[PDB]
Amino acid sequence: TLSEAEKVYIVHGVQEDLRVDGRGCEDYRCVEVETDVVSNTSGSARVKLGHTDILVGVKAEMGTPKLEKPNEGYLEFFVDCSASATPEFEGRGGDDLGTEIANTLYRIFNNKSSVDLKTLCISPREHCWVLYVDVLLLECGGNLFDAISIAVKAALFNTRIPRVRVLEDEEGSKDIELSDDPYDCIRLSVENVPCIVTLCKIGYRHVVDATLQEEACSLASLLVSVTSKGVVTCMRKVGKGSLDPESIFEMMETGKRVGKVLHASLQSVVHKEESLGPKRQKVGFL
Amino acid sequence: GDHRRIRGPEESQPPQLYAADEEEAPGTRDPTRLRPVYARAGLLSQAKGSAYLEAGGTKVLCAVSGPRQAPAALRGRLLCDFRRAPFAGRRRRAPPGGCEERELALALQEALEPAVRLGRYPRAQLEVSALLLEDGGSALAAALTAAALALADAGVEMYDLVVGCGLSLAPGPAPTWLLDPTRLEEERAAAGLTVALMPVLNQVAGLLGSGEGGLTESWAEAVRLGLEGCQRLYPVLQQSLVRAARRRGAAA
Amino acid sequence: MKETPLSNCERRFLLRAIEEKKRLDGRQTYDYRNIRISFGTDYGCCIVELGKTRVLGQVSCELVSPKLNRATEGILFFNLELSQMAAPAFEPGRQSDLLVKLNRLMERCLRNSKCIDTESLCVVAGEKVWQIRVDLHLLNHDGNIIDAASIAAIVALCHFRRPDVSVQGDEVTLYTPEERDPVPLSIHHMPICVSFAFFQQGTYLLVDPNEREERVMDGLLVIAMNKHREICTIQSSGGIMLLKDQVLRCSKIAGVKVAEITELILKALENDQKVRKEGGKFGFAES
Amino acid sequence: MLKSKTFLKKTRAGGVMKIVREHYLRDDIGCGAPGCAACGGAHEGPALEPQPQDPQPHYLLPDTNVLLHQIDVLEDPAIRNVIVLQTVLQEVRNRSAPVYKRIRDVTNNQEKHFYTFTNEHHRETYVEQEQGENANDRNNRAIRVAAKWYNEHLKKMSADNQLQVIFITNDRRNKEKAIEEGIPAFTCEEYVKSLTANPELIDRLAIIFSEHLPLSKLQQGIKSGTYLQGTFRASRENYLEATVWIHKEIILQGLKHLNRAVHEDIVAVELLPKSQWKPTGRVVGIIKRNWRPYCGMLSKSDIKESRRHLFTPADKRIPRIRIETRQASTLEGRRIIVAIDGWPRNSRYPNGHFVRNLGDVGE
Amino acid sequence: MAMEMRLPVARKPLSERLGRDTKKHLVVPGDTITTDTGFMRGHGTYMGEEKLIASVAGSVERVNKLICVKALKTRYIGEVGDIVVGRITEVQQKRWKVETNSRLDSVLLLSSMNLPGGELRRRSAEDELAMRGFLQEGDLISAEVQAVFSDGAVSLHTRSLKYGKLGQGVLVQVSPSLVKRQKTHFHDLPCGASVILGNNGFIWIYPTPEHKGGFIANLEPVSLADREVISRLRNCIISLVTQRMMLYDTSILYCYEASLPHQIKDILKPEIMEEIVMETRQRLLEQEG
Amino acid sequence: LELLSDQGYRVDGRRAGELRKIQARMGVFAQADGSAYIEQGNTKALAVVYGPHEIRGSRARALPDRALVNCQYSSATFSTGERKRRPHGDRKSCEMGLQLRQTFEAAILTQLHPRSQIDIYVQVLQADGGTYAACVNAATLAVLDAGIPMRDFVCACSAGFVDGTALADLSHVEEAAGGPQLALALLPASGQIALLEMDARLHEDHLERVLEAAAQAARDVHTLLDRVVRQHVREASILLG
Ligand SMILES: [Zn+2]
The missing domain is CATH 2.40.50.100 (RNA polymerase II/Efflux pump adaptor protein, barrel-sandwich hybrid domain)
Incomplete structure (x- = not known):
């Protein structure tokens, strides 16, 4: 929280196109992306966006597919909002935000065109892959959703599911055949996995990467989910305040542009890193 | 095993999944159409305010347990409990839930906090309780409207009413935005959307959406269409509240 | 509700009587209280009361689908409940720390020590196996639980008998206690804990502390043992600084204590079997 | 140093996951020879000898196949000295328990110098894995690097007028590849011939079951035609001659035709053409499994870590069983009883489980 | 963008x-x-x-x-004359409860806060009820300690009108072991602004006025030429602290003078941060000795 | 597979008496009052200490004599290969909380921060054996980074027993083997144990061995940690002036 006069300062700043960090209204801040942090996972990633640090693990397990969709697998999301973020979270107080974030992440992926799940099926109705994604919060410094999304995408890109031949046999005896080639592990496309974008409205001007101090100064925030093409999967609204019908359109256009930029930058970065190789040494938490 | 409810079976799957047929598709209709609405406020007695709304197979209650002791810190609160009856929808779900009930509750709260004015209700929490008896299409919108009716009935102050409206996308080759659809048009759909606004001052209060796909212009057209629908719906609710107030005047 | 507070008078008096090596009731430091083991009518019930602390233990069975990782051996389910009759403070869902620590300790002690044969109790490897649960209930709370809870679980799991079963291929046939004679369990060794209490940062140590001694103690050392001198578990709680020789001596004590308790338990079971072989649905043993 | 090696695994719960283990590359490992200072002088236990003489000095190191198929050529005492690796020993352990046990029992002998060298945990001979190269290739290349490493080390140690190492194979492919890698290499035959010692050295050297059709097809075929059910039975005579009694007496032999029956079951015999008959029958399915707790004893694998143990029932008309118990310390010596649970399409033995112990033999 | x-x-x-x-x-x-x-x-x-x-x-x-x-x-830890900046957290019937980077909840007794102007007679119930409408929960106060209790808490007061409640400005939270114990924490810099350096880790940055005690809120705009300076000072302080060096007049002035070429935003990127900090440190060290 | 080769080596390639290289750091998260990170092999613990601060929702628990230590444990789902759910609220994480609490209430020297919460938090990102000791040590580094007074490095580690010998700082493999594992946490300066957990069957005369072995392993851990801490303090002071 904070006072009223500070809010006046911040809102007139935005209306003037400056901010305490001396940046405009369409400018994120240096986001330190890293991938392949943890080892026991089939995929992992980490983000440090200003003062918000997120970790993401991805485990590809084998499970029964879903009766209504046996031809392909599924993603599940869990979100540990560790109290290490702010002590006001505990074994019961973080369930709220965790549930919110998980429901969002699901809503981003009831799209059927983001992660081609058909590629995750081994034997219909009998076995399939399952992507257990596990987000882990370590700080809360705002623009939380965008960072969580970037981590989900970096982890997917960094996910390596192994090839398995599930051979049927009579008298109910099943066998799984691995491929002893950890270098021959499959890779799921992310050309559609979307990034979140949080446009918080302050005064009569909208803003991206709404730092906390500015979130407290706002009244509404439109979350958009964009893909590198330009479509808009999800469009949610969060805030204890109102929101005009016209500003929605500006928010959406800005989200479109920012998503383009974000996906470009991320793709370039992660191709770079995948090129380097083990020479990078994987500096993490050290 | 839950030790606060009756000992039932571990798991239980419905029979439909064991059916063998291509279910019937709706077909064609007037895209800018609205279903017939029956909205009445004042149904329930033991509650300070209650409201009931029926639109097609949709059937929703809402009650308002009024101020209950519990500036910007001495500002009121309202906690909303959305809850779909286990006998709504093709499938059954245990009463608790924990996946979508809470999401829609957050939605209702984010769409009601603006309209309601809580400076005049300090140190108090309004318990809003929605109940979905039957799902037949746009549900969250019906719930917003019903909660608005219940609040306006209990006599809590406001700035304007809340009107919702749900839209879907036709997955045909020429995809058109389908207004106020049915559970069939909604399960056979590509994208869904929900607007909610305050029509006097023409301000959105809470919206939501999702998509197998879409694009900026399409979403914008959907938005404006839902706004027009909400406008065309407002008078029903107006008349309902007037009617309930007349009945109260009659009782005394 | 709440427990009545402890006066400084009682606290100081206790500390002094410890300094002078004097317990309250009149026993030494290396002594338990008279523990009685009484049995019920149904195979699997035991009421063990050490002094004033009474604890009940029931053992029940079921057949269920096993867990995939272990499709050969069965299952075992501990649970200890702190009945409000044990003491006022034991409201439901309030004294959760004590529940957690006791249950984890007991699970560890019995399960991970491999006290019983989870394999012998297999019926259909992959489809149906046994499931033995044991419910301990705390009735009166005067001092030492872990010892009582353990003695109870052990007397039960050694005084329990399964409904016999016949099998051919996949055809499994259960039968009633009246049609055949239930079959007992398979134990390898009976462990029972032993509780030491530290006073004045580690200087003094007592056995089987009462409730007051638990209120004016800083530390608790639990040690599980058998008649064969096999550490099964040891735990230090209370945030206390002990040393090596202390644990060594405490272990050399627990040895004798567990030997004696074990002799008693065996005598109790012997007497109960003898009684039922003469007409009578009870069995009683006294320290 | 430190190396993180990953590898996938199939669970017990029909699933796959990954492991990431550490591998420490110590540089304080010993060659086994005293002369090599900079490796450690005071190094007791099993170790080599300064002057060997049966290329007179002739240290040597074999490959896996040699340990697996000519251990008697080595267990012999006419030899004196030899090097042993880690990969060889690990493979031997994975394939054969008796061979591994013998090699350990010999390494425990201070005289027959089977000094072991941990190559995996050494900073120089260690070699990573490479895409497109199976584990067998991994171990082979590791052994080659070890040989090459050994030749250089013992080369710089002294004037080389004292010691020289040898590589030994069983097949000539590996030998020729070694030569093309620039080192000596022989086969066991050449060597055991070259010594012209007593002839004792050469003297000491010179199922997948069918499928099973479900009960539906069996019951459909019996009434309709060919197949016919009957009680299977075996004999104390032979493990293969078996008799089926129809509800007439068929005979059938061979572990295939004996497609997983037991002393008393309900088999669905098919009849073979008259080109083989007194008749000869075959089995393709079971109508009713009829098992019971078989009494017997637990023959263990000397590996004290292994869980899978073999079980010998008393009635000669039953096959040994492959059970999973972990005890294997309290049971050997005490008649137990086991219940059978299956016979899949991969094992010459079934899968059972312990149900109770009775008491030591003889009582 | x-x-x-x-x-x-x-x-x-x-x-x-x-x-x-x-x-x-x-x-x-x-x-x-x-x-x-x-x-x-x-x-x-x-x-x-x-x-x-x-x-x-x-x-x-x-x-x-x-x-x-x-x-x-x-x-x-509470001293006896150290100035301090504090964010309020609660309003008890008798006093205000304030949050400093302290191990407890600092306290401002209703008797301590100065009154509008000098209208000093005594404290009555009317003041007890204005206790809220004047000093809202969440506001900021620039005070100095009055005393330290045996329970650890800090009772603080307002000696004069230079203290009291604060305007709009901006704020930073740093560690308290990075402000030199010296005099005149209240500075008014030539850059076009002014700064308050708590003996705690709360720094306040406000534009300097022209007239020369918070009893009125001048919620007017601030010239761009006086918000850019404040933002640059904010980022310069964050830079200094991220490199673990002390903090006082000359440090902030010289980091400022260093960060003119590099624009108002690109001086948190660790390379620019480090080089600015190095320049400042070297020039302080060499000029002072 | 094996645990102790006849030569004396382990699987990982280390003798019984040694352990794996801990690699640590102090100052990860700045929005807190104290933070640390440690990797004691493949393990990766992460600690945080929100300092001695005010109690809210007083609920009549603000001890007036001493301070109130509240330590929370958490083992991430993706820590083990087998995914799990409900990392908090379980009956094991709460036991770990109790353990850490009775340790640090012993060490943290609370008599100087009465009516104040010391909130300790621990998250385990990766687990490969020795999951309690890594957390003890990370929380120690955190406390120290938060300038919270404390009697001594409360250094922890684990020992085990295999083939008539004692192993130090077990891993997951020999931890799954079922053999006796004894975890402990002591204060080196005085030689006093702050905690002693242990879980498996073994004879009594074989106790002193694993006990002194765990103690010596903890001494080594003390050396490594203190070298880290001294580097940290030196760098910070140099940067000050
Ligand atoms: Zn050498």
């Missing part, structure tokens, strides 16, 4: 860029300070078996006969 992503680079520890080899006496818990005849103990140590044993990580300090420790990260 402009977005940028970048991988994480590994730190460069040991701060070898300086090369000092300090002449201090560092310690850690368990370490045994000099054991001699009657040495007095201070904050950051304790005694065991006639042996002086450290308790906290830092450098030891031996005043004439007193042995104390000066840790490198702590929470603001």
Whole structure:
């Protein structure tokens, strides 16, 4: 929280196109992306966006597919909002935000065109892959959703599911055949996995990467989910305040542009890193 | 095993999944159409305010347990409990839930906090309780409207009413935005959307959406269409509240 | 509700009587209280009361689908409940720390020590196996639980008998206690804990502390043992600084204590079997 | 140093996951020879000898196949000295328990110098894995690097007028590849011939079951035609001659035709053409499994870590069983009883489980 | 617009860029300070078996006969004249409860807060009810300590009208072990602004007025030429602290003067941060000696 | 597979008496009052200490004599290969909380921060054996970074027993083998144990061995940690002036 006069300062700043960090209204801040942090996972990633640090693990397990969709697998999301973020979270107080974030992440992926799940099926109705994604919060410094999304995408890109031949046999005896080639592990496309974008409205001007101090100064925030093409999967609204019908359109256009930029930058970065190789040494938490 | 409810079976799957047929598709209709609405406020007695709304197979209650002791810190609160009856929808779900009930509750709260004015209700929490008896299409919108009716009935102050409206996308080759659809048009759909606004001052209060796909212009057209629908719906609710107030005047 | 507070008078008096090596009731430091083991009518019930602390233990069975990782051996389910009759403070869902620590300790002690044969109790490897649960209930709370809870679980799991079963291929046939004679369990060794209490940062140590001694103690050392001198578990709680020789001596004590308790338990079971072989649905043993 | 090696695994719960283990590359490992200072002088236990003489000095190191198929050529005492690796020993352990046990029992002998060298945990001979190269290739290349490493080390140690190492194979492919890698290499035959010692050295050297059709097809075929059910039975005579009694007496032999029956079951015999008959029958399915707790004893694998143990029932008309118990310390010596649970399409033995112990033999 | 992503680079520890080899006496818990005849103990140590044993990580300090420790990260312990900046948290019937970087909840008694102008007669119930409408929950106060209680809390007051409630400005939260204990924490810099440097880790930055006690809120706009300066100072302070150097007039003025070429936003990127900090440090060191 | 080769080596390639290289750091998260990170092999613990601060929702628990230590444990789902759910609220994480609490209430020297919460938090990102000791040590580094007084490095580690010998700082493999594992946490300066957990069957005369072995392993851990801490303090002071 904070006072009223500070809010006046911040809102007139935005209306003037400056901010305490001396940046405009369409400018994120240096986001330190890293991938392949943890080892026991089939995929992992980490983000440090200003003062918000997120970790993401991805485990590809084998499970029964879903009766209504046996031809392909599924993603599940869990979100540990560790109290290490702010002590006001505990074994019961973080369930709220965790549930919110998980429901969002699901809503981003009831799209059927983001992660081609058909590629995750081994034997219909009998076995399939399952992507257990596990987000882990370590700080809360705002623009939380965008960072969580970037981590989900970096982890997917960094996910390596192994090839398995599930051979049927009579008298109910099943066998799984691995491929002893950890270098021959499959890779799921992310050309559609979307990034979140949080446009918080302050005064009569909208803003991206709404730092906390500015979130407290706002009244509404439109979350958009964009893909590198330009479509808009999800469009949610969060805030204890109102929101005009016209500003929605500006928010959406800005989200479109920012998503383009974000996906470009991320793709370039992660191709770079995948090129380097083990020479990078994987500096993490050290 | 839950030790606060009756000992039932571990798991239980419905029979439909064991059916063998291509279910019937709706077909064609007037895209800018609205279903017939029956909205009445004042149904329930033991509650300070209650409201009931029926639109097609949709059937929703809402009650308002009024101020209950519990500036910007001495500002009121309202906690909303959305809850779909286990006998709504093709499938059954245990009463608790924990996946979508809470999401829609957050939605209702984010769409009601603006309209309601809580400076005049300090140190108090309004318990809003929605109940979905039957799902037949746009549900969250019906719930917003019903909660608005219940609040306006209990006599809590406001700035304007809340009107919702749900839209879907036709997955045909020429995809058109389908207004106020049915559970069939909604399960056979590509994208869904929900607007909610305050029509006097023409301000959105809470919206939501999702998509197998879409694009900026399409979403914008959907938005404006839902706004027009909400406008065309407002008078029903107006008349309902007037009617309930007349009945109260009659009782005394 | 709440427990009545402890006066400084009682606290100081206790500390002094410890300094002078004097317990309250009149026993030494290396002594338990008279523990009685009484049995019920149904195979699997035991009421063990050490002094004033009474604890009940029931053992029940079921057949269920096993867990995939272990499709050969069965299952075992501990649970200890702190009945409000044990003491006022034991409201439901309030004294959760004590529940957690006791249950984890007991699970560890019995399960991970491999006290019983989870394999012998297999019926259909992959489809149906046994499931033995044991419910301990705390009735009166005067001092030492872990010892009582353990003695109870052990007397039960050694005084329990399964409904016999016949099998051919996949055809499994259960039968009633009246049609055949239930079959007992398979134990390898009976462990029972032993509780030491530290006073004045580690200087003094007592056995089987009462409730007051638990209120004016800083530390608790639990040690599980058998008649064969096999550490099964040891735990230090209370945030206390002990040393090596202390644990060594405490272990050399627990040895004798567990030997004696074990002799008693065996005598109790012997007497109960003898009684039922003469007409009578009870069995009683006294320290 | 430190190396993180990953590898996938199939669970017990029909699933796959990954492991990431550490591998420490110590540089304080010993060659086994005293002369090599900079490796450690005071190094007791099993170790080599300064002057060997049966290329007179002739240290040597074999490959896996040699340990697996000519251990008697080595267990012999006419030899004196030899090097042993880690990969060889690990493979031997994975394939054969008796061979591994013998090699350990010999390494425990201070005289027959089977000094072991941990190559995996050494900073120089260690070699990573490479895409497109199976584990067998991994171990082979590791052994080659070890040989090459050994030749250089013992080369710089002294004037080389004292010691020289040898590589030994069983097949000539590996030998020729070694030569093309620039080192000596022989086969066991050449060597055991070259010594012209007593002839004792050469003297000491010179199922997948069918499928099973479900009960539906069996019951459909019996009434309709060919197949016919009957009680299977075996004999104390032979493990293969078996008799089926129809509800007439068929005979059938061979572990295939004996497609997983037991002393008393309900088999669905098919009849073979008259080109083989007194008749000869075959089995393709079971109508009713009829098992019971078989009494017997637990023959263990000397590996004290292994869980899978073999079980010998008393009635000669039953096959040994492959059970999973972990005890294997309290049971050997005490008649137990086991219940059978299956016979899949991969094992010459079934899968059972312990149900109770009775008491030591003889009582 | 402009977005940028970048991988994480590994730190460069040991701060070898300086090369000092300090002449201090560092310690850690368990370490045994000099054991001699009657040495007095201070904050950051304790005694065991006639042996002086450290308790906290830092450098030891031996005043004439007193042995104390000066840790490198702590929470603001209460002195008796130190100024302070505080964010309010609660409004109790008798007083206000304030949040400093302290181990408890600082306290401003209703008797302490100055009154509008000098209309000083006494405190009555009307003041007890204005206790809220004037000093809202969440506001900021620039006070100085009055006293420290035995329970650890800090009662603070407002000696004059230069203190009291604060305008709109901006704020930063740093560690309290990074502000030199000196005089005149209240500075008014030539850049076009003014700054308050708490003996705690709360720094306040406000534009300097022209007239020359918070009883009125001048919620007017601020010229761009006076918000850009404030933002640059904010980022410069964050830079300084991220490099673990002290903080006072000259430090902030010289980091400012250093960050004119580099624009108002690009001086948190660790390279620019580090080079600015190095320039400032070197020039301070060389000019002062 | 094997645990102790006849030569004396382990699987990982280390003898019984040694352990794996801990690699640590102090100062991860700045929005807190104290933070740390440690990797004691493949393990990766992460600690945080929100300093001695005010109690809210007083609920009549603000001890007036001493301070109130509240330590929370958490083992991430993706820590083990087998995914799990409900990392908090379980009956094991709460036991770990109790353990850490009775340790640090012993060490943290609370008599100087009465009516104040010391909130300790621990998250385990990766687990490969020795999951309690890594957390003890990370929380120790955190406390120290937060300038919270404390008697001594409360250093922890684990020992085990295999083939008539004692192993130090077990891993997951020999931890799954079922053999006796004894975890403990002591204060080196005085030689006093702050905690002693242990879980498996073994004879009594074989106790002193694993006990002194775990103690010596903890001494080594003390050396490594204190070297880290001294580097940290030196760098910070140099940067000050
Ligand atoms: Zn050598």
